[PDB]
Design a binder for this molecule. Structure first.
Ligand SMILES: *[C@@H]1O[C@H](CO)[C@@H](O[C@@H]2O[C@H](CO)[C@@H](O[C@@H]3O[C@H](CO)[C@@H](O)[C@H](O[C@H]4O[C@H](CO)[C@@H](O)[C@H](O)[C@@H]4O)[C@@H]3O)[C@H](O)[C@H]2NC(C)=O)[C@H](O)[C@H]1NC(C)=O
Ligand SMILES: *[C@@H]1O[C@H](CO)[C@@H](O[C@@H]2O[C@H](CO)[C@@H](O[C@@H]3O[C@H](CO)[C@@H](O)[C@H](O[C@H]4O[C@H](CO)[C@@H](O)[C@H](O)[C@@H]4O)[C@@H]3O)[C@H](O)[C@H]2NC(C)=O)[C@H](O)[C@H]1NC(C)=O
Ligand SMILES: *[C@@H]1O[C@H](CO)[C@@H](O[C@@H]2O[C@H](CO)[C@@H](O[C@@H]3O[C@H](CO)[C@@H](O)[C@H](O)[C@@H]3O)[C@H](O)[C@H]2NC(C)=O)[C@H](O)[C@H]1NC(C)=O
Ligand SMILES: *[C@@H]1O[C@H](CO)[C@@H](O[C@@H]2O[C@H](CO)[C@@H](O[C@@H]3O[C@H](CO)[C@@H](O)[C@H](O)[C@@H]3O)[C@H](O)[C@H]2NC(C)=O)[C@H](O)[C@H]1NC(C)=O
Ligand SMILES: *[C@@H]1O[C@H](CO)[C@@H](O[C@@H]2O[C@H](CO)[C@@H](O)[C@H](O)[C@H]2NC(C)=O)[C@H](O)[C@H]1NC(C)=O
Ligand SMILES: *[C@@H]1O[C@H](CO)[C@@H](O[C@@H]2O[C@H](CO)[C@@H](O)[C@H](O)[C@H]2NC(C)=O)[C@H](O)[C@H]1NC(C)=O
Ligand SMILES: CCCCc1nc2c(N)nc3ccccc3c2n1Cc1cccc(CN)c1
Ligand SMILES: CCCCc1nc2c(N)nc3ccccc3c2n1Cc1cccc(CN)c1
Ligand SMILES: *[C@@H]1O[C@H](CO)[C@@H](O)[C@H](O)[C@H]1NC(C)=O
Ligand SMILES: *[C@@H]1O[C@H](CO)[C@@H](O)[C@H](O)[C@H]1NC(C)=O
Ligand SMILES: *[C@@H]1O[C@H](CO)[C@@H](O)[C@H](O)[C@H]1NC(C)=O
Ligand SMILES: *[C@@H]1O[C@H](CO)[C@@H](O)[C@H](O)[C@H]1NC(C)=O
Ligand SMILES: *[C@@H]1O[C@H](CO)[C@@H](O)[C@H](O)[C@H]1NC(C)=O
Ligand SMILES: *[C@@H]1O[C@H](CO)[C@@H](O)[C@H](O)[C@H]1NC(C)=O
Lengths: 748, 748
């Protein structure tokens, strides 16, 4: 029996049951299921019958039910002897639910309406390791100060993580377990940290005190400062017994001075976050810096003085004692010029690999200074003024984004310089003098309108990944970029400015000159006319992204000039012609696509016709993507035209008929996506081969199926081929007749 | 009887029958219909039965049938004694159809496959005034040279317009009617114009000879030059008897010299088009210019010398004899600098109002020179390099676009300067010195990232319409633009660059300072956080476009800061909150919308809920647009909440139920759009008032209607309210049951 309404899975056994409009815990869950995800449904009541006979349940996720309060009876879960993880986020719960099972090691009640943390609801959960209560009372929510029963956490002697962020606390609760490794108290309205607060927490590796006495100017959320925008008050001995602290978060605590004695018994401190404070003075002096010879990451972002646009950044000499430092983040300090001598203190630190000066309104940099660091790998200068020479995710970081500064594919080639979002509108015979051996260069969004001519990158000739996106480049010279012999990836996306104008000349001939070029992105360039040379040619190129151009124009029926546009891409395996307004492709142009292709995307066009017989000329073709078109016709003889194709994507088309022996004899086809077409039925001979079907996935959701006895053949087929996954059966719905309408074809 | 499948109309009586998937000329056309539009259907055969009993037909449009050859029997139309205009474009016709009715005054056979123009098909059509045969053989189409039977047009003595463009002709046909006013022979492969060719065409006001011996370098279409890219050869006396010529089109005829004697007997010539020739030398000397004292429009665009980037443009002194000149178009000449003395010859011409220098790669202009013209009104400098100081529509112009240079709403305020698509990335204490009294200023797409501060426009303080779109403006000063006291329209669209960054400050306070500001466009700015002042305020503002911002964030449930964001817009009547990702609007924020509103758009959001009762606080509200959301619920008591609302737009929502007495008692509602929702039926009490319904339009197409006997009530209602137009009944389709599926609810 193919499972329903949940999708079950492989490896422990998962019931994927989220987001399928369920009203109750459905009663047809596989009795062998260990993990049940019921999140994002319309479930409103939970009782002792809800999970009965699912006694092997280890994890239940009920996050985000119902979608626009969850009712949980006392003891509702108390049966499930093996229940370890219970996730009850975003449920509008008024209280901790009563009579939870003592087997719990993980309980998340994030984003509910619980202002009372009691012994009654918690103190018995003696096996709890992770307890999450964040984001119950915050910002301008109408909510109550949170009452924590004295001693409530004391009995929890296995507790390693406790999160109370984004609740109104006022004080650090007394009588916390000495088992704690991670304590989260961000934005809890605590103004004073005493000596007793953390005294017995000798296993703590992480303490987050961010957002208490916040710096409120220009906050993107409702923000309540401490009287007079004063600092957090942290007793001299607050951290004296926290010898195992690796992580300390003091962002937006309105700090003006950092007491070096806070760090005296913290020899392992690794990551220190001091964002959104007032530490310009502390950065320029910085006694505390001497206490941190093992620090790896230091974040001093958004410490700018309101109203101030100083000429220079002022870094203490004491930064030279940060011997382990690997990353320094100095965004939002705000300054006009970076000179060589201003970073002297950083230049001997052996492991300093990332310098982040994002968002400083810097107008000029003496670039030669970067060489003098011992080993930079990521010089991040995005979003400055350099010129020619849930509202908030409770499970994310609130003060910044955690994404890599540089795209990992670009940074993997070596040393990276990101000058994106500046004003280098023209390079510059000497723009890149005195730089290291830059491998990854990001010049996206610099308003560049120059004609590149083959000499502009001559001082950084080993760039291997070049990002030129979102400029205004005038591609009017056949030698552009040819100085970059090692170039492997080139991204020219969103440079439509001159391609748009038919009366200026356009030259893409340089593409052929590269011997190592693997990936070229020409997307969203509105390319519809080229000058003299009408063809793209390269012996190396493996991937071309040609989405968001005008192949409808290039391949217009009355024009032969571009019918070989891609044929000289002799090595190509992956081609993307999406978003090109194509109504049909001339036969001859389709036949002139590279025979090497393994992957072809023509999705989101307006294709009314596809010549399937032309697939014969593409013996390596494995994936064909035709989603989002206006196709009506499937061939009845695919096996005559291909023995390679593994995946065929056809969702969002107008196919109302699957032909007799459609499947036959297409051995290679593993995945067929027919979702969102106009199929009313599927007849017995449509899926039939007497040969061996390797079909493992068939998508059918969003078809207007007629649920009369004519569906019974397909139903029988589903019974007889349990190995062919049909996902989201709850969305494989009857459109007709009216008694059936809305119901899954399976439940009939 | 409500008509079907066509929509009939008012004023002569129109059958709008286009684009509704018809297979035959439908037989249910109103016998009183004078004009029948059957274009864009799937019609494949036309016979003598097709229009029978539609004897009052004056005009038939069969353009673009079938959609992917039309068959017309001999004499098929010969009945229709009153047929004057027959439109048979884009039909893939192999021949002129035989036995057309001699009543024809207008025949269009554009874009067919007709290579033979015969007496047999044409010579009897003695009343023809306009005959269109263009675009039958062209570019790389597989087609034949066109054979014109000698004398074929001679018998057509009422012919005033003849179009043979985009066919292969080789020679001007002999024996053309002397009745001609307009002769179109563009791109006909004629290389020589003799003395006999136009000798007897003394009524001609227009001659188009463009595209014969074309200039082919960088053409955006297949283009065949005359041997050696030679010029068109026009005999000295070719135009000697064309005294009534007003329009002459010689674009792309590869002209290097213009013979002044061509214009000797052309005293009324008004518009002369000399685009895409090689007239740089002729522009600098230009004897022919002396022959043209009545010329109003002169177009010399794209006469650039390939490969050449001269410093200056060189205009003959002879331009000073163009006494009537009103517009001069000099795009694509290509030059580096415009100096005062270079336009001396233009400065005394009293009526010269438009100068177009688009697309010249101009780097600098001495702006003071514009003042010295007698009266410029449109100084068009778009798309240069100024710095801080159907494939082709057969019914359009092929060599340029015909749109206004400047938007008519901007140009209507007075003198216009369009500096769009340049590199004025910073203004400039002296940027606008020595200009006339500029009323309409276009600075769109100049990569501007400055902080405007209230002094930048002080030398052009009477700008009334200001276009700042598609820049990178840093709105970080409360005085920005306040020097512009007369400003009425301000467009700040697509300046999301700094609004996107939460950690920089953002200031929109200046808005309040203007006393005449009527229209403000803040669209696509990703606005989600502002500094200090959270409200937009203006006592004058009548229209705010706030589409493509983040009201979902601004109005987040946990934040009160922005719940009055628009309430200080005390005069507002039109507000656009589309494309703001709204899932719902807090009640209090909706109630704080200006009570003056007459027009409110919240389309293309994700609204799952709408509080209809809040409409009580908006007594002037006439149009509510909620299309493109996820609404399920309509109130049953609209009349309790509004007596003003005239138009309610709800297409593309999820409404499956119309309530009992929905219509009641909403006197004011004229137009209700319920297309593309989930209605299965409409019950009798849903549309029922015993009061007076002023409903004149009801849209229902794209609803999954169940066509059983439960539809009969609505059908009866349709019969009983013929005055309530339901458009596109062919698209008001049955989804169920399967016998009915696909069929219009009306035809059941
Ligand atoms: C103050 O600084 C501290 C120390 O840096 C910082 O601690 C980090 O908090 C976040 C919680 O926001 C933790 O990140 C989570 O870690 C867990 C456990 O490994 C993961 O499950 C989470 O990943 C899931 O969720 C993500 C976001 O939705 C998804 O993108 C992801 O793909 C997963 O689904 C998430 O990474 C992080 O571990 C701690 N750091 C530790 C313990 O070292 C804290 O957030 C800062 N405080 C504030 C208020 O900013
Ligand atoms: C050479 O120059 C000549 C002289 O300027 C130029 O003549 C113009 O040709 C066009 C045909 O392209 C005519 O424009 C049409 O005029 C008719 C009649 O009034 C209108 O019906 C047309 O408007 C409809 O079609 C438009 C385009 O689809 C729609 O936008 C519009 O809204 C209407 O539906 C259209 O305006 C124009 O009248 C003549 N000029 C005259 C007679 O003065 C000629 O095209 C140039 N040749 C080439 C090849 O470029
Ligand atoms: C221009 O096109 C290039 C090449 O297609 C785009 O880069 C590619 O982006 C895709 C994702 O869109 C990357 O693949 C993904 O990466 C991770 C694995 O690392 C995986 O999770 C995903 O399932 C998927 O494989 C791909 O690596 C990346 N390629 C390179 C060379 O960087 C680029 O994004 C396009 N540019 C723009 C502006 O759209
Ligand atoms: C920013 O918003 C302004 C104001 O809404 C936009 O300008 C307006 O554009 C509309 C059309 O989108 C114009 O109305 C139309 O004009 C003609 C009549 O002249 C009519 O045919 C149409 O039915 C409709 O009325 C409106 O006049 C124009 N307003 C002004 C003051 O110019 C502007 O386009 C927006 N900018 C961007 C970049 O989107
Ligand atoms: C080059 O710089 C641009 C701009 O910072 C980067 O674009 C960002 O890319 C990430 C993910 O690729 C997106 O989620 C952000 O939206 C982008 N921001 C903008 C403004 O586009 C780009 O990724 C950087 N490229 C490389 C190779 O590191
Ligand atoms: C200001 O300049 C811009 C760029 O030339 C104009 O934007 C064009 O507007 C027309 C119609 O409004 C569009 O059909 C074109 O697509 C636009 N081009 C681009 C690149 O956006 C704008 O209309 C001009 N504004 C005024 C008021 O004249
Ligand atoms: C109307 C433009 C004619 C041909 C042309 N295209 C370009 C272009 N894309 N960018 C330019 C940037 C600066 C100057 C000219 C162009 C340009 N031109 C004219 C041109 C002049 C000299 C040399 C070249 C080289 N292709 C082209
Ligand atoms: C991290 C930025 C802090 C506040 C700020 N926002 C801006 C901004 N939007 N544009 C600038 C352009 C140039 C220099 C600074 C800013 C800027 N800043 C810092 C700032 C410094 C001095 C004065 C001001 C005036 N609002 C703001
Ligand atoms: C710098 O990094 C390397 C590991 O990559 C490590 O071996 C060395 O100990 C580091 N130096 C310091 C002072 O932390
Ligand atoms: C073709 O692409 C493959 C895969 O990257 C690469 O190894 C090979 O070097 C390329 N061939 C040529 C001729 O460049
Ligand atoms: C498909 O292309 C082949 C070219 O190999 C041709 O024989 C056949 O005519 C094409 N089918 C259609 C419908 O154009
Ligand atoms: C300039 O234009 C006006 C009409 O606006 C007209 O009266 C006058 O005759 C024109 N002058 C010439 C020389 O054509
Ligand atoms: C309000 O708008 C109307 C319509 O433009 C205008 O006449 C009036 O002057 C404006 N009112 C104020 C106070 O500016
Ligand atoms: C609609 O808004 C009014 C506020 O006047 C309120 O009484 C009613 O509760 C609102 N309805 C909903 C469903 O929020």
């Amino acid at each position: 029996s193919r499972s329903y309404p949940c999708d079950e899975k492989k490896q422990s056994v998962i019931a994927e049951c989220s987001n399928r409009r369920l009203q109750e815990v459905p009663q047809t869950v596989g009795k062998y299921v260990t993990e049940l995800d019921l999140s994002d449904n319309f479930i409103t009541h939970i009782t002792n019958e809800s999970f009965q006979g699912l006694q092997n349940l280890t994890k239940i996720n009920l996050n985000h039910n119902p979608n626009v309060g969850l009712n949980i009876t006392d003891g509702a879960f108390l049966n499930l002897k093996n229940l370890r993880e219970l996730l009850l986020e975003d449920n509008q719960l008024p209280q901790i639910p009563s009579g939870l099972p003592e087997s719990l090691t993980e309980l998340s009640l994030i984003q509910n309406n619980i202002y009372n943390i009691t012994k009654e609801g918690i103190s018995r959960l003696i096996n709890l390791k992770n307890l999450y209560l964040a984001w119950n009372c915050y910002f301008n929510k109408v909510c109550e100060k949170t009452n924590i029963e004295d001693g409530v956490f004391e009995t929890l002697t296995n507790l390693e993580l406790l999160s109370l962020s984004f609740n109104s606390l006022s004080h650090v609760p007394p009588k916390l377990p000495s088992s704690l490794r991670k304590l989260f108290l961000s934005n809890t309205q605590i103004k004073y940290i005493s000596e007793e607060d953390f005294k017995g927490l000798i296993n703590l590796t992480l303490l987050d005190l961010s957002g208490n006495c916040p710096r409120c100017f220009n906050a993107p959320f409702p923000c309540v400062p401490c009287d007079g925008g004063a600092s957090i008050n942290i007793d001299r001995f607050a951290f004296q017994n926290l010898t195992q602290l690796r992580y300390l978060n003091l962002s937006s605590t309105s700090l003006r001075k950092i007491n070096a004695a806070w760090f005296k018994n913290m020899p392992h401190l690794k990551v220190l976050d001091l964002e959104f404070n007032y530490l310009v003075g502390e950065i320029a002096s910085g006694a505390f810096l001497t206490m941190l010879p093992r620090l790896e990451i230091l974040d001093l972002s958004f410490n700018y003085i309101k109203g101030s646009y100083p000429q220079h950044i002022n870094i203490s000499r004491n930064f030279s004692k940060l011997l382990s430092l690997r990353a320094l983040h100095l965004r939002g300090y705000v300054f006009q010029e970076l000179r060589e001598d201003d970073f002297q203190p950083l230049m001997q630190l052996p492991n300093l690999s990332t310098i982040n000066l994002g968002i400083n309104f810097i107008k000029q940099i003496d670039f030669k200074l970067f060489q003098n660091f011992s080993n930079l790998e990521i010089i991040y200068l995005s979003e400055n003024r350099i010129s020619p020479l849930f509202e908030f995710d409770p499970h994310s970081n609130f003060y910044h984004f955690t994404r890599p500064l540089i795209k990992p594919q670009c940074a993997a080639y070596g040393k990276a310089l990101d000058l994106s979002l500046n004003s280098i509108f023209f390079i510059g015979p000497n723009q890149f003098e005195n730089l290291p051996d830059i491998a990854c260069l990001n010049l996206s969004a610099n308003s560049n309108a120059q004609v590149l001519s083959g000499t502009e990158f001559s001082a950084i000739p080993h760039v291997k990944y070049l990002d030129l996106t979102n400029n205004r480049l005038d591609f009017d010279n056949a030698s552009a970029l040819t100085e970059l012999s090692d170039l492997e990836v080139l991204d020219l996306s969103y440079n439509s400015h001159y391609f748009r104008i038919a009366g200026v000349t356009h030259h893409l001939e340089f593409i052929q000159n590269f011997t190592n070029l693997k990936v070229l992105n020409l997307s969203h360039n509105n390319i519809y006319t080229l000058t003299d040379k009408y063809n793209l040619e390269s012996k190396s190129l493996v991937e071309l992204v040609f989405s968001g151009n005008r192949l409808d124009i290039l391949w217009n029926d009355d024009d032969n000039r571009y019918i070989s546009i891609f044929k000289g891409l002799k090595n190509l395996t992956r081609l993307d012609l999406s978003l090109n307004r194509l109504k049909h492709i001339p036969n001859e142009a389709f036949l002139n696509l590279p025979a090497s292709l393994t992957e072809l995307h023509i999705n989101d066009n307006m294709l009314k016709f596809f010549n399937w017989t032309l697939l014969q000329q593409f013996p390596r073709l494995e994936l064909l993507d035709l989603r989002g078109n206006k196709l009506l016709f499937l061939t009845d003889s695919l096996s005559d035209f291909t023995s390679s194709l593994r995946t065929l994507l056809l969702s969002h088309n107008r196919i109302s008929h699957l032909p007799s022996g459609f499947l036959s004899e297409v051995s290679s086809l593993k995945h067929l996506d027919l979702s969102s077409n106009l199929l009313k039925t599927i007849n017995k001979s449509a899926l039939e081969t007497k040969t061996t079907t390797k079909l493992s996935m068939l998508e059918l959701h969003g078809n207007p199926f007629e649920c009369t006895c004519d569906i019974g053949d397909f139903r029988r087929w589903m019974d007889e081929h349990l190995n062919v996954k049909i996902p989201r059966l709850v969305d494989v719905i009857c459109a007709s007749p009216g008694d059936q309408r809305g119901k899954s074809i399976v439940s009939l």
